[PDB]
Amino acid sequence: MFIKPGRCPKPAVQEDFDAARYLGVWYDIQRLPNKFQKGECATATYSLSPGVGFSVFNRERLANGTIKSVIGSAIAEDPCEPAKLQFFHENAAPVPYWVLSTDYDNYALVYSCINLGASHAAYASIVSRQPTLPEETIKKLQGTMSSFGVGVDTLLTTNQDAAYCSAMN
Amino acid sequence: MFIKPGRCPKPAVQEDFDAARYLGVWYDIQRLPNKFQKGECATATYSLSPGVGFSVFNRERLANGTIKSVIGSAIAEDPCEPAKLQFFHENAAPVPYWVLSTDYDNYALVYSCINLGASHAAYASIVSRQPTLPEETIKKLQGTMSSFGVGVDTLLTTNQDAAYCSAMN
Amino acid sequence: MFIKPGRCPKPAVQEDFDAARYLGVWYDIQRLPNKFQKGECATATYSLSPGVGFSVFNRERLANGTIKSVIGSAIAEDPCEPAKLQFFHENAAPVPYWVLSTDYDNYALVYSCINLGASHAAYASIVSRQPTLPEETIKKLQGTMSSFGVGVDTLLTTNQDAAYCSAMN
Amino acid sequence: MFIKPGRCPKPAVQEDFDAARYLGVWYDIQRLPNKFQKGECATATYSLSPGVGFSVFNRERLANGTIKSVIGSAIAEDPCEPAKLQFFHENAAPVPYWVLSTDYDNYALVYSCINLGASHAAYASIVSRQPTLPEETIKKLQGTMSSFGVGVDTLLTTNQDAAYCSAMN
Ligand SMILES: C=CC1=C(C)/C(=C/c2[nH]c(/C=C3N=C(/C=C4\NC(=O)C(C)=C4C=C)C(C)=C\3CCC(=O)O)c(CCC(=O)O)c2C)NC1=O
Ligand SMILES: C=CC1=C(C)/C(=C/c2[nH]c(/C=C3N=C(/C=C4\NC(=O)C(C)=C4C=C)C(C)=C\3CCC(=O)O)c(CCC(=O)O)c2C)NC1=O
Ligand SMILES: C=CC1=C(C)/C(=C/c2[nH]c(/C=C3N=C(/C=C4\NC(=O)C(C)=C4C=C)C(C)=C\3CCC(=O)O)c(CCC(=O)O)c2C)NC1=O
Ligand SMILES: C=CC1=C(C)/C(=C/c2[nH]c(/C=C3N=C(/C=C4\NC(=O)C(C)=C4C=C)C(C)=C\3CCC(=O)O)c(CCC(=O)O)c2C)NC1=O
C-alpha cells in the first residue's frame, strides 16, 4: 500500500546540515514505491539559487526512451532546522523533504511523510554521488529506516545500468 | 487507488451553513473507499460542545459483531466559512471536512481532501437522517461529485440492513 | 512593544503533560502585555469536553466593573506533544498555547508565540491554583522565561485583590 | 498600532496574475507602518529563478546613508492562485504576499496579513515602475484598501527624492 497505518514518524535528521555541500547531482539507488517516478535512472540535481534555498531539477528515463524532468525549489522554512526542507515542484502542492543522513560525498538518505488522519503516506530514497552505492552503505541506511518503521522490503531498486540509462547522458 | 492524480479540487460548499441544524445522527449511505471504516452500519453523531464547534462520535459494526467507535471534535477555524471544518479525532492528525450540500433534515454530502504533491487522497460520503436515502437524491449528489472529478463508480454502498445492523441499537 | 525582533523561540515544554490534572480553575498572576486582556482578576477555567481536548472559559473584570468572558476549545493537534496545544476562542483565529511547566496543583507557566517575518508576537502567563503565588515560585518561572529571551521586565502583575475582584464572585 | 482588532480580511486578488510581467524593479510609493523598513528610497527587484517562483532583492537607504538589503524567494504554493504568494526572506519566517491589483507596467498594490487571535497585523504597499506615481492612481489604490478596512490615513509616503536617494545609485 502507498497509504500505511499510523501517523508520520519523526526520525532524526542530519546534524549540522550544510546545503552547499549537498548541491550537485545525486542518483536514485533505492526508493519507496511512489506515484511520481514513472521510469528509471532517476537523478536529482540541486543548484544555487539567487534567492533563499536551492533549486531542484529531477530527471528520469521513461520506458519509451524519452527523458522526463521537473523543476522545483527547496527551502528550509526554519533556518535553525536546515535539514528539514519544503520542496515546491512545478504543478505540485508543497511536500516535506528531510535529509536524515548524508556524508555529502557518497550517500544521502531522504524521507518525506504526510499525515492522512490515523494513516500516512511516506516516501524515502537512498541516493548516491555515483550510479551505484556499496551494499554495506545500503544496509546501514536500511537499518536506519527500519528503526522508525519503514518497510524496507518494499524498497524498489532503481535501474541505473550504464547502457539502459545512456540517454540521461 | 486511494491516492489519485491531481491536486485536491475546491468544490463549492453549503451556503449559509448552520451547524446547529446539522447536529444529531447521520447514517453513512455511500462513501469512497477509505482506511478508517473497517465495518458496516456506520453512523456519525454530532453533539453540542461547551467550547467552540461541536463534538463527534462515529460508530460502526465490525464483522465480529462488536461496535467500534471514535470520539472527535469539529471546528470551523474560519468562522466566516462555517462549512469548512477541521475534524480532530482521537489519535489522528487533523483532517478537513467540508459540508458540500445538506438540507439538514434528509441528506448531506461531505468531502475531505489532502494534497500529496501532484496527487491527492480524498474521502467523500453521502449521509442520511435515515438508514436509507431515495435513489433520486443519491444520483443528484453523485452528479455533484462527478462535476469536480470524483470517481462515483468507486463509491461503496454501506450495509444499513436492519437485521445486520441491529447491534447498533 | 508587542512585536519584537527575531523569530519565535522554541522553549521546552512540560514533560508527560497530563491534561486531566490541568483542568479546573487557574488565576492569572503575571502576564506579558497583550491585546485581549482589558481588565484584571483574570481567570481561566478548563473543563471536560465530550470530544477531544478540553473546553475553555476565560473571565476578567473590566475597570467599569463589568465581567467579560470568552469560550474556546483546546486541542493538542499532535497527540505525542500533549503540552503543545492549539486554542480556538470564539471569533478568533487559532493560537498556540504551550504549557512550559506545571505541577498541576499550584502553578503553571504558559507560552504562545506567532511569527511576523523577522519579528514575533509573544504572550506568556504565570497562573496559580490560588489568587496569589509564592514569590519564590514566581522568580523560578521568570527565570525560565528569561532563559529563552522573554523580557520579564515587561510583565504585568495582575490585580487579584479579593475586594476589587469580588464581582468575579 | 501595528496590531489592530479583528481577523485578517480576504481581499480579492489580481485576476490572471502573470508573474513574468511582474518581474523587474518596483519603487515603494506608500506603505503601512511596519517593522522591516527602517529607511527610505525602498525598492523591490524581482528576478527569474531556475526553480519555481521568482527571486527577491529588496533595498533601502537608511538615515545614515547606508544601503541595506535582503534576499528572498517568492512562491505561489497553490499554482491556481498565482497572485497569492509566500515570500521567504533570509532569516525570516515565511510571510504572505498578495498582489491585489497591478497593470504590470505602472503600478501594483500588495497586501499581507497575519492573524493574532482576535487581532491582526497587516502590511500593504503601493509600488510603481517609477520613483513616483500619478496622484489619481494612488487615490484609486487607496480606495481599494479602504474598501476592506485598511486605515489609509496611516500610510507613510516613501521618500523617493532623486537627490536623497542617490546612494541607491
Ligand atoms: C483524508 C481524509 C480523512 C478523513 C475524512 C478521516 C476521518 C476519520 N474517520 C475516523 C473514524 C470513523 N469514521 C467513521 C464514520 C464517518 N466518518 C465520517 O467522516 C462520516 C461522514 C462518517 C459516517 C457517516 C466511523 C464509523 C469511524 C470509526 C472507525 C472504527 O474505529 O472502526 C478516523 C479515526 C482514525 C481511524 O480510525 O483511522 C478519522 C481520522 N480520516 C482521513 O484520513
Ligand atoms: C508525499 C511525498 C511526496 C514527495 C517527496 C514528492 C516529490 C516529487 N517528486 C516529483 C518528481 C520527480 N522526482 C524525481 C526524483 C527524485 N525525487 C526525489 O525527491 C529524490 C530524492 C529523487 C531522485 C533521487 C524525478 C526523476 C521526478 C520527475 C518524474 C517525472 O516527471 O517523470 C514531483 C512532481 C509531481 C509529480 O511528477 O508527481 C513531486 C511532488 N511528491 C510527493 O507526493
Ligand atoms: C498571540 C497569542 C495570543 C493568545 C495566547 C491569545 C489568547 C486569547 N485570549 C482571549 C481572551 C481572554 N483570555 C483571558 C485570560 C487568559 N488567557 C490565557 O491564555 C491565560 C493563561 C489567561 C488567564 C489566566 C481572558 C480573561 C479573556 C477574555 C478577555 C475579555 O473578553 O475581556 C482571546 C479572545 C479574543 C480576544 O478577546 O482578543 C484570545 C484569542 N490571543 C492571542 O493573540
Ligand atoms: C506581516 C507581514 C510581513 C511582510 C510582508 C514582511 C516582509 C519583509 N520585508 C523584509 C525586508 C525589506 N522589505 C523591503 C521593501 C519591500 N518589501 C515589500 O514587501 C515591498 C512591496 C517593498 C518595497 C517596494 C526592504 C527595502 C527590506 C530590507 C529592509 C532593511 O533591511 O533595512 C523582510 C526582512 C526581515 C526584516 O528585515 O524585518 C521581511 C520578512 N515582513 C512581515 O512581517
Ligand positioned closest to the Cα atom of D6? 3
DSSP-based three-state secondary structure for A19? helix
Answer whether C152's CB lies under 8 Å from C29's CB.
Answer: no
The residue whose grid cell reads 491531481 is B6
Q: Which residues of C touch D92 (CB under 8 A)?
A: 7, 117-118
Ligand positioned closest to the Cα atom of B38? 1
Is the minimum CB–CB distance between C136 and chain D shorter than 8 Å? no
Is the minimum CB–CB distance between C74 and chain B shorter than 8 Å? yes
Chains with ≥3 Cβ pairs under 8 A against A? B, C, D
Indicate if ligand 2 lies below 6 Å from the C-beta of A144: no
DSSP-based three-state secondary structure for C57? strand
Chains with ≥3 Cβ pairs under 8 A against B? A, C, D
Look up the CATH number of the domain holding residue A20: 2.40.128.20
Residue A73 neighbours by CB under 8 Å, 6+ apart: A49, A51, A53, A54, A55, A56, A87, A88, D49, D51, D52, D53, D73, D75
Closest CA to A57 of A75, A73, A35, A41: A73
- What's the maximum distance between 2 C-alpha atoms anywhere in chain D? 44
Residue B20: give the domain boundaries.
Answer: 1-169
Among positive and negative, which fits the CA dihedral B67, B73, B76, B79?
A: positive
User: In the structure, how many helices (H) and strands (E) does chain B have?
Assistant: 2, 10
Please count the other Cβ atoms lying within 10 Å of the Cβ belonging to residue A153: 7
Between CA A140 and CA A107 the distance in angstroms is 11
Ligand positioned closest to the Cα atom of B116? 2
CA distances from C67 to A71, C41, C55, C64, D117 (A): 57, 10, 19, 9, 20
Ligand positioned closest to the Cα atom of C126? 3
Tell me, what amino acid is at B30?
A: Q
- Beta-bridged to residue D74, according to DSSP, are D54, D87
Residue nearest to atom 43 of ligand 2 (CA): B117
Answer whether C41's CB lies under 8 Å from C165's CB.
Answer: yes
Indicate if ligand 2 lies below 6 Å from the C-beta of A129: no
The residue whose grid cell reads 528509471 is A40
The Cβ-side half-sphere exposure at A61, using a 13 Å CA radius, reads 17
Instruction: Using most ligand atoms within 8 A of CB, pick from B14, B26, B36, B66 the residue to mutate for ligand 1.
Output: B36
Between CA A71 and CA D50 the distance in angstroms is 8
Between CA C112 and CA C123 the distance in angstroms is 5
For residue B114, what is the enclosing H or E element? strand B107-116
Between CA A21 and CA A11 the distance in angstroms is 22
- Beta-bridged to residue B61, according to DSSP, are B40, B67
Between CA D7 and CA C116 the distance in angstroms is 15
Full DSSP string of B56-109: EEEEEE-TTS-EEEEEEEEE-SSTT-TTEEEEEETTS--EEEEEEEE-SSSEEE
Instruction: Tell if the CB–CB gap between B49 and C73 is shorter than 8 Å.
Output: yes
What does DSSP assign to residue D144? H
Indicate if ligand 2 lies below 6 Å from the C-beta of A101: no
Indicate if ligand 4 lies below 6 Å from the C-beta of C117: yes
The residue whose grid cell reads 545609485 is D169
Mutate one of C8, C52, C77, C78 to test the A interface: name it (highest A CB count within 10 A): C78
Answer whether A73's CB lies under 8 Å from D49's CB.
Answer: yes
Closest CA to D13 of D148, D155, D122: D148
Indicate if ligand 1 lies below 6 Å from the C-beta of B116: no
Please count the other Cβ atoms lying within 10 Å of the Cβ belonging to residue B137: 16
User: In the structure, how many helices (H) and strands (E) does chain A have?
Assistant: 2, 10
Between CA C124 and CA C114 the distance in angstroms is 12
What does DSSP assign to residue B154? G
Between CA A165 and CA A131 the distance in angstroms is 10
Q: How many CB pairs under 8 A join B and D?
A: 3
Indicate if ligand 2 lies below 6 Å from the C-beta of A114: yes
Please count the other Cβ atoms lying within 10 Å of the Cβ belonging to residue B107: 21
The residue whose grid cell reads 492528525 is B93
- Reading the block at residue A162, the C-alpha cell is 550504464
Which ligand 4 atom minimizes the distance to the CA of D27?
A: 24
Residue C22 CA to ligand 3 centre (angstroms): 18
Is the minimum CB–CB distance between A36 and chain B shorter than 8 Å? yes
Tell me, what amino acid is at C125?
A: S
Answer whether B115's CB lies under 8 Å from A93's CB.
Answer: yes
- Reading the block at residue D133, the C-alpha cell is 506615481
The residue whose grid cell reads 479546573 is C24
Residue C24 CA to ligand 1 centre (angstroms): 31
Q: How many domains does chain C have?
A: 1
Residue D36 CA to ligand 4 centre (angstroms): 5
Nearest-by-Cβ selection for B36 from A7, A114, A117: A117
Indicate if ligand 1 lies below 6 Å from the C-beta of A117: yes
What does DSSP assign to residue B144? H
Between CA D60 and CA D69 the distance in angstroms is 6
Which ligand 4 atom minimizes the distance to the CA of D36?
A: 38
Which residue of chain A has the CA closest to D73? A51
Q: Which residues of D touch C110 (CB under 8 A)?
A: none
Between CA A54 and CA A50 the distance in angstroms is 8
Method of determination?
X-ray
CA distances from A99 to A36, A42, D90, D93, D134 (A): 19, 18, 21, 20, 51
Which pairs count as long-range contacts for D3-6, CB under 8 Å and 24+ apart, including other chains?
D3/C2, D3/C3, D3/C35, D3/C121, D3/D116, D3/D119, D3/D120, D3/D121, D4/D119, D4/D120, D4/D121, D4/D122, D4/D151, D5/C35, D5/D118, D5/D119, D6/D118, D6/D119, D6/D120, D6/D149
CA distances from A7 to A117, B146, C72, C75, D159 (A): 7, 30, 26, 17, 53
Tell me, what amino acid is at C37?
A: Q
CA distances from D66 to D38, D59, D90 (A): 11, 10, 19
Instruction: Tell if the CB–CB gap between B88 and C49 is shorter than 8 Å.
Output: no
Mutate one of B52, B78, B120, B148 to test the D interface: name it (highest D CB count within 10 A): B78
Which residue of chain A has the CA closest to B4? A35
- Reading the block at residue D129, the C-alpha cell is 515602475
For residue A156, what is the enclosing H or E element? strand A156-157
Residue A57 neighbours by CB under 8 Å, 6+ apart: A44, A45, A46, A47, A69, A70, A71, A72, D50
CA distances from C21 to B133, C13, C102 (A): 45, 16, 10
CA distances from B146 to B149, C38, C78 (A): 5, 51, 34
Answer whether D95's CB lies under 8 Å from D114's CB.
Answer: yes
Between CA D79 and CA D98 the distance in angstroms is 14
Instruction: Tell if the CB–CB gap between D93 and C2 is shorter than 8 Å.
Output: no
Write out C19-50 in H/E/C secondary structure. Answer: HHHHCEEEEEEEECCCCCCCCEEEEEEEEECC
Instruction: Using most ligand atoms within 8 A of CB, pick from B32, B58, B84, B89 the residue to mutate for ligand 1.
Output: B58
Indicate if ligand 4 lies below 6 Å from the C-beta of D14: no
Closest CA to C4 of C148, C144, C157: C148
State the resolution, in angstroms: 1.8
CA distances from B9 to A167, B1, D166 (A): 36, 17, 50
Between CA A42 and CA D96 the distance in angstroms is 34
Full DSSP string of A76-125: -SSTT-TTEEEEEETTS--EEEEEEEE-SSSEEEEEEEEEETTEEEEEEE
